[PDB]
Write a protein that binds this ligand. Structure first.
Ligand code: NAP
Ligand code: NAP
Lengths: 358, 353
């Protein structure tokens, strides 16, 4: 059972690689990959693309056909339409699933299979399955979505101020990385101060992508992340660039604004707490609305509050090697009295530093 | 044949690698490595150890002796009286020599028929004596400015891994620089502890060889008192003063006189002053103000930033605060070399160009 240790280690790795092809367009649904082996050859493969599309497990079987009978299904997440009938119907001995269902009492999916004679197992490379759905996994376990907070800084610790979205991030390669990260998030969040001062679009520009351009992401599949903008004071206007983009835009409001907005604009009402809009109840609310993940593009004040409230799951920090002085204000300021470094990479002439809440 | 300029890439590498063995203890002299090859076997090896210890060649040639006659002598840097008598039939120096009035010592051997051919792997030779080379070409010693920061600019209270990392960097420098402001607030030793090194512990750096960097304190107003720990450590500690102090100091305390400039000591003169003083390299340990000033007077050759995974208070100070540094957009800019993990910290290396 050591050969199969490696043998399974391989198909499962493939089944995960497949799952990610869906990472840009799958929200609010998890990513899921499926690989079906018969007598040591892959007879059917599949993964989740769009939200209203049929499951990975199903493409895999519709491709494998009669050849599914013999043996093995590597799935990325415990299977469970009726989707478990589907698997029985085709006739597979053995399924090896990476992680069992995130929610509680629904962890029984495998038992249903065991019952029909199928051999099962869970746990293999589970740690990576976990990584593949950080957001949707957290949403299910806790109320909330996974918040990523991106900061850009110069060596001397300063940033930007009133300069235009285009100058958020200096270098081409860094700009290009940020697009890539935005492109996988469910929502992008931003303050009203930022919209006011910068008139941004906060969209993913498809041209600015590397060789994911081929991966999935045909230009027409392009899915624009949901723009969430905060403002108690209803200061933003129907003419601002941010509401004219394709894609939904959502306002977190403290009280209903009366003006005409286009059909793709919604408002969420949030209670006030010690002066301004209750950040924590926004996060739950967005969780009730199925936001898996929220990528923050804010100034200092907002990044400050999010961190103080302890709602930030990861920090993506971009340092540029340039020095500044006064024009552009500091990067945080914090009175109160948490983090750990994960990946650090070069991004052309900038470095990118990932930190994680854990 | 071109296996000659391929067999050479091997032997010179041994020569460079030997030289390094001396970085900790060599100052104010340069690092130098020599490998004497005959018929395929290295018959003699040597490298510069202490301040006034036998040249690399002297050990390399005593070791080789009679068997020096036949073949090649790979040097790191150009030599000169014992090489000719021992009678080698080819040298390969790595770099011409900085000092640039001289540079005819390699030819002086072509003179004695001995074949020559410099320039090999020169890239790394330069890199081996950054300070010395810098100090020879300009009047100015090489400056590494350490910066400890939290996630949000702002300033040590970084890891022990970081403490041990700086120890090894400290050990490689000729001199350490701090402000009186740091001495007062932290009463430091700014020494090198041998027990904090890792596997330099062995290759050279034997415990009793341990050489303490020179301690330089910028102290305009003579605020630092003769009973602080910094002056009671083993080694020399030199005070940069705007005017003579009248107290009785321990015997290891010297004091360099520097003129005032717009309130404070003039850092540019001080650096030139230290170059006349024979200092190759200065490791700078202080808070944001001095750092701001060094960056702004364009005096810093490289940057070592440690970030810590921590947020500090508002009343924390950092480069991000600080009024004076408006024209920093105009001082010489930097570029990222290497980034790496240090325990729970990252260390980011920035360099000149
Ligand atoms: N990466 C970059 O270089 C980059 C990116 C984005 C923005 N920026 C710059 O940042 C600047 C804006 O900075 P800023 O500090 O003025 O504003 P901000 O941080 O962008 O947003 C402040 C807003 O956030 C909300 N907020 C603040 N504290 C809160 C709290 N404690 N609890 C709940 N909500 C809170 C408030 O919104 P309401 O009052 O509307 O309720 C407040 O007006 C702009 O000039 C922009 O150019 C730079
Ligand atoms: N090395 C480290 O990573 C480390 C370790 C422990 C503590 N610290 C922190 O460092 C902090 C130091 O605070 P700080 O920023 O006020 O002091 P600092 O930058 O370390 O030193 C300021 C001193 O530098 C000199 N100076 C400043 N500007 C100058 C200029 N333009 N030209 C010539 N000389 C100039 C002055 O010395 P004179 O008095 O002689 O005029 C001044 O008092 C401490 O509070 C401590 O907590 C840092």
């Amino acid at each position: 059972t050591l050969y199969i240790q490696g043998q399974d280690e391989y198909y499962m790795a493939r089944a995960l690689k497949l799952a990610q092809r869906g990472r840009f367009t799958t929200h609010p649904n998890p990513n899921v990959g499926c690989v079906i082996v018969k007598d040591g050859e892959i007879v059917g493969e599949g993964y989740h693309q769009r939200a209203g599309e049929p499951h990975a497990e199903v493409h895999a079987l519709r491709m494998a056909g009669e050849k599914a009978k013999g043996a093995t299904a590597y799935v990325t997440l415990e299977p469970c339409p009726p989707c478990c009938d589907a698997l029985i119907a085709a006739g597979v001995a053995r399924v090896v699933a990476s992680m069992q269902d995130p929610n509680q009492v629904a962890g029984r999916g495998l038992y249903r299979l065991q019952q029909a004679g199928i051999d099962v197992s869970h746990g293999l490379m589970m740690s990576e399955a976990e990584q593949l759905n950080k957001g949707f996994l957290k949403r299910m376990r806790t109320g909330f979505p996974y918040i990523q907070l991106k900061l850009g800084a110069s060596l001397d610790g300063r940033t930007a101020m009133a300069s235009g979205e285009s100058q958020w991030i200096t270098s081409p390669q860094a700009r290009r990385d940020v697009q890539l990260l935005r492109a996988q998030s469910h929502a992008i969040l931003t303050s009203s101060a930022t919209v006011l001062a910068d008139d941004p679009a906060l969209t993913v520009r498809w041209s600015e992508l590397d060789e994911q351009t081929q991966a999935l992401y045909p230009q027409q599949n392009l899915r624009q992340p949901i723009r969430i903008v905060i403002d108690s004071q209803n200061r933003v206007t129907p003419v601002h660039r941010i509401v004219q983009q394709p894609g939904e835009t959502w306002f977190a409001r403290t009280q209903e604004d009366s003006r005409e907005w286009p059909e793709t604009v919604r408002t969420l009402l949030i209670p006030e707490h010690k002066g301004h809009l209750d950040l924590v109840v926004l996060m739950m609310q967005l969780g009730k609305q199925q936001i898996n993940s929220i990528w923050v593009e804010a100034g200092p004040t907002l990044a400050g509050a999010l961190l103080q409230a302890g709602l930030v799951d990861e920090l993506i920090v971009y340092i540029a090697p340039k020095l500044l002085g006064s024009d552009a204000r500091g990067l945080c300021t914090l009175p109160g009295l948490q983090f750990k470094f994960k990946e650090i990479r070069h991004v052309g002439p900038d470095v990118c530093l990932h930190l994680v809440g854990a």
